[PDB]
């Protein structure tokens, strides 16, 4: 029964979607197609791959008229969102014939990024090689686009085509409006009342491993410093006590953190719309033969899903407004929001601007809408999941095994809605003051930005700010391997900042690894002082020789980590450049050759944005 399969005859399912998904664009899209299935008279669940074992596909075929769909999204470099790893890994060493599964697969992507909608690709040819049958296209969404609107496109076509192939069609009966229900509870132990656990009940005060994504552990934070300056901006650094967790963990991986929105924020909502966030309740399904009983986890007050299950701070989406405005006892309003969340190009330009790129979140709606009163539990089955934030471990576990350490900016701006702001999970980390205890529930997601398999090959490291995160890790790490009697190569830091008063981030640290000469090459540049601004690209310009001996002779890994897409461009283009001058080569030679390096693991990236 831990077979999704099995789960799935239990609760009579025939359709199952799998969402790869980080920031729950997919989930949704895979939330969405499920309950779609009974539009068409048959049944369909959601589904998280890390939580099974994909290799049951093969007993699929055991339920009649099953179908498997999956909403994937692609990550850096073409890489896998961290829930759907095991899943991709399986795929890629399994061999296994999938005769008789039934699947189509949605691809979410951005067209700007070089590996557009790897993952979806890889998912959809890999399936059909094992011997599954495509029952529609790979659909190819594109987030530099409207991807919405893709998902749309490729859904009103995917459904005709799947009623076709199984024999099935349209029901047309009641629209629903609302899939939730509101059960309050006037009496109810506290021993059943979540209170921002993710997964079981009490799981949080309960703490037993396994620990993942649906099992957080809750880790005590030790040390939380401020590592700039300055005053303009806060750069901390924190470190999390991961003791007898058996959370393991290398440099280069990442932590997600679950975190809690500001408290004065969600008084505010709660009072705007006039209603007792203290209040006890649980939201079902209208329906009772889906899968997805709750919106989020149940019961649980008001006050708590809004503080820890719920998204109030990212601009809401059109369908949300659209939704919104049969609220609006204000004509002129009702039409506004309309206008906001319609398809014409006015429409969109509007929500653009005004909802995007202001930065409005539901609060900001409410409060320029006043004749938009909403109940408020039909705003909270509107709204999306918090999503979890994920920080580049500064720390080896080599010498760091129970302690992940993070690196990070605190999140705060006047946005163009003429208010200010507040990152959720950096203001939140932010207040974590050690010593109860302050806990941090995270898990561990492991990456590919790893160091060389050997120790003697060659590291180069670029990256801006806080993109010197993963790099502190990695020179812990190659520090402590030079300890332990072992042969090093070269390790290398190309190190960006504004100013050397402002933030220059782990300054004691560094010295004291570039003294032992664990740190072989320690450049740094500073932006932000007179016209002459000095970028990461150009200390590697200056150091065009050396580099290209440890990249064309000495076999050197290459590591560029930072927010800026456009940081990495440059570096890119920087090391395209080095290759073509001293081959020499081409440019158009050049830039397979780094390509070439990248395919061969041996060109890294860990960009954010
Ligand atoms: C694999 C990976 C690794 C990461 N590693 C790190 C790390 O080591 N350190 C680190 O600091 N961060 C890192 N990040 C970024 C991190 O995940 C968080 O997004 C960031 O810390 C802010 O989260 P928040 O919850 O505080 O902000 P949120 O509340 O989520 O707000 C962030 C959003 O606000 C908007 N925004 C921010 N500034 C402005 C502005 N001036 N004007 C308009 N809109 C703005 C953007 O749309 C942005 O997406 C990483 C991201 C990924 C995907
Ligand atoms: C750090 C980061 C890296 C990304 N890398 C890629 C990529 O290589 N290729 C691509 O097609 N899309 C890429 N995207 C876009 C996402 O796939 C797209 O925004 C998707 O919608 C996110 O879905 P989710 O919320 O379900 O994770 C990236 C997004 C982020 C934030």
Same mark, same amino acid.
């Given at each position: 029964?831990?077979?999704?399969?099995?789960?799935?005859?239990? +609760?009579?399912?025939?359709?199952?979607?799998?969402?790869?998904?980080?920031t729950?664009?997919?989930? @949704?899209?895979?939330?969405?197609?499920?309950?779609?299935?009974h539009? /068409?008279?048959?049944?369909?669940?959601?589904?998280?791959?890390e939580? !099974?074992?994909?290799?049951? *596909?093969?007993?699929?075929?055991?339920?009649?008229?099953?179908?498997?769909?999956?909403?994937?999204?692609?990550?850096?470099?073409?890489?896998?969102?961290?829930?759907?790893?095991?899943?991709?890994?399986?795929?890629?060493?399994?061999?296994?014939?999938?005769?008789?599964?039934?699947?189509?697969?949605?691809?979410?992507?951005?067209?700007? /990024?070089?590996?557009?909608?790897?993952?979806?690709?890889? %998912?959809?040819?890999?399936?059909?090689?094992?011997? &599954?049958?495509?029952?529609?296209?790979?659909?190819?969404?594109? $987030?530099?686009?409207?991807?919405?609107?893709?998902?749309?496109?490729?859904?009103?076509?995917?459904?005709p085509?799947? #009623?076709?192939?199984?024999g099935?069609? #349209?029901?047309?009966?009641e629209?629903?409006i609302?899939? /939730?229900?509101?059960?309050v509870? @006037?009496?109810? $132990?506290?021993?059943?009342?979540?209170?921002?656990?993710?997964?079981?009940?009490?799981? !949080?005060?309960?703490?037993?491993?396994?620990?993942?994504?649906?099992?957080?552990?809750?880790?005590?934070?030790t040390?939380?410093?401020?590592?700039?300056?300055?005053? @303009?901006?806060?750069?901390?650094?924190?470190?999390?006590?991961?003791?007898?967790?058996?959370?393991?963990?290398?440099?280069?991986?990442?932590?997600?953190?679950?975190?809690?929105?500001?408290?004065?924020?969600?008084?505010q909502?709660?009072?705007?719309?006039?209603?007792?966030? $203290?209040?006890?309740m649980?939201?079902?399904?209208?329906?009772?033969?889906?899968?997805?009983?709750?919106?989020?986890?149940?019961?649980?007050?008001?006050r708590?899903?809004?503080?820890?299950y719920?998204?109030?701070?990212?601009?809401?989406? =059109?369908?949300? *407004?659209?939704? *919104?405005?049969?609220?609006?006892?204000?004509?002129?309003?009702?039409?506004?929001?309309?206008?906001?969340?319609?398809?014409?190009?006015?429409?969109?330009?509007?929500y653009?601007?005004?909802?995007?790129?202001?930065?409005?979140?539901?609060?900001?709606?409410?409060?320029?809408?006043?004749?938009?009163?909403?109940?408020?539990?039909?705003?909270?089955?509107?709204?999306?999941?918090?999503?979890?934030?994920?920080?580049?471990?500064?720390?080896?576990?080599?010498?760091?095994?129970?302690?992940?350490?993070?690196?990070?900016?605190? %999140?705060? !701006?006047?946005?163009?809605?003429?208010?200010?702001?507040?990152?959720?999970?950096?203001?939140?980390?932010?207040?974590?003051?050690?010593?109860?205890?302050?806990? %941090?529930?995270?898990?561990?997601?492991?990456?590919?930005?790893?160091?060389?398999?050997?120790?003697? +090959?060659?590291?180069?490291?670029?990256?801006?700010?806080?993109?010197?995160?993963?790099?502190?890790?990695?020179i812990?790490?190659?520090?402590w391997?030079?300890?332990?009697?072992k042969?090093?190569?070269?390790?290398?830091?190309?190190?960006? &900042?504004?100013?050397?008063?402002?933030?220059?981030?782990?300054?004691?640290?560094?010295?004291?690894?570039?003294?032992?000469?664990?740190? =072989?090459?320690?450049?740094?540049?500073?932006s932000? @002082?007179?016209?002459?601004?000095?970028?990461?690209?150009?200390?590697?310009?200056? $150091?065009?020789?050396?580099?290209?001996?440890?990249?064309?002779?000495?076999?050197?890994?290459?590591?560029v980590?930072?927010?800026?897409?456009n940081? &990495?461009?440059?570096?890119?283009? +920087?090391?395209?450049?080095?290759? &073509?001058?001293?081959?020499?080569?081409?440019h =158009?030679?050049?830039?397979? !050759?780094?390509?070439?390096?990248?395919?061969?693991?041996?060109?890294?990236?860990?960009?954010?944005?």
């Amino acid at each position: 029964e831990s077979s999704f399969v099995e789960k799935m005859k239990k +609760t009579g399912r025939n359709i199952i979607v799998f969402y790869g998904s980080q920031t729950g664009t997919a989930e @949704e899209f895979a939330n969405r197609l499920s309950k779609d299935a009974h539009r /068409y008279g048959m049944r369909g669940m959601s589904a998280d791959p890390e939580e !099974y074992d994909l290799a049951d *596909l093969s007993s699929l075929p055991e339920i009649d008229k099953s179908l498997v769909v999956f909403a994937m999204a692609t990550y850096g470099e073409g890489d896998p969102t961290c829930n759907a790893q095991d899943f991709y890994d399986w795929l890629q060493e399994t061999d296994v014939d999938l005769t008789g599964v039934k699947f189509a697969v949605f691809g979410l992507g951005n067209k700007t /990024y070089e590996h557009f909608n790897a993952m979806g690709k890889y %998912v959809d040819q890999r399936l059909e090689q094992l011997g &599954a049958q495509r029952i529609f296209e790979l659909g190819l969404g594109d $987030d530099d686009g409207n991807l919405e609107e893709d998902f749309i496109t490729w859904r009103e076509q995917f459904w005709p085509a799947v #009623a076709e192939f199984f024999g099935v069609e #349209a029901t047309g009966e009641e629209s629903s409006i609302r899939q /939730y229900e509101l059960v309050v509870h @006037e009496d109810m $132990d506290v021993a059943k009342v979540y209170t921002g656990e993710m997964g079981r009940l009490k799981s !949080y005060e309960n703490q037993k491993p396994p620990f993942d994504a649906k099992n957080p552990f809750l880790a005590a934070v030790t040390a939380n410093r401020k590592l700039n300056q300055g005053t @303009e901006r806060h750069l901390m650094h924190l470190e999390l006590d991961i003791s007898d967790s058996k959370i393991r963990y290398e440099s280069g991986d990442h932590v997600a953190v679950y975190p809690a929105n500001d408290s004065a924020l969600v008084n505010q909502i709660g009072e705007i719309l006039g209603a007792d966030l $203290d209040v006890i309740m649980s939201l079902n399904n209208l329906d009772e033969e889906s899968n997805k009983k709750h919106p989020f986890p149940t019961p649980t007050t008001y006050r708590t899903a809004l503080t820890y299950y719920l998204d109030i701070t990212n601009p809401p989406r =059109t369908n949300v *407004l659209y939704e *919104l405005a049969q609220y609006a006892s204000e004509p002129s309003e009702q039409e506004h929001l309309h206008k906001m969340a319609s398809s014409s190009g006015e429409g969109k330009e509007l929500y653009l601007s005004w909802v995007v790129e202001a930065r409005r979140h539901i609060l900001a709606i409410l409060q320029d809408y006043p004749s938009l009163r909403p109940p408020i539990d039909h705003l909270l089955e509107l709204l999306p999941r918090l999503q979890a934030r994920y920080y580049s471990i500064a720390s080896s576990s080599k010498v760091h095994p129970n302690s992940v350490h993070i690196t990070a900016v605190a %999140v705060e !701006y006047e946005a163009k809605s003429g208010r200010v702001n507040k990152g959720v999970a950096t203001s939140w980390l932010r207040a974590k003051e050690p010593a109860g205890r302050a806990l %941090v529930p995270m898990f561990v997601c492991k990456s590919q930005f790893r160091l060389p398999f050997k120790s003697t +090959t060659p590291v180069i490291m670029v990256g801006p700010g806080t993109g010197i995160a993963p790099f502190m890790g990695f020179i812990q790490e190659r520090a402590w391997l030079r300890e332990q009697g072992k042969e090093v190569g070269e390790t290398l830091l190309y190190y960006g &900042a504004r100013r050397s008063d402002e933030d220059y981030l782990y300054r004691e640290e560094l010295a004291r690894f570039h003294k032992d000469g664990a740190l =072989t090459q320690l450049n740094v540049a500073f932006s932000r @002082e007179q016209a002459h601004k000095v970028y990461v690209q150009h200390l590697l310009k200056r $150091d065009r020789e050396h580099l290209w001996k440890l990249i064309h002779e000495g076999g050197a890994h290459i590591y560029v980590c930072g927010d800026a897409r456009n940081m &990495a461009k440059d570096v890119q283009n +920087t090391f395209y450049d080095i290759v &073509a001058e001293f081959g020499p080569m081409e440019h =158009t030679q050049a830039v397979d !050759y780094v390509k070439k390096l990248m395919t061969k693991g041996r060109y890294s990236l860990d960009v954010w944005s």
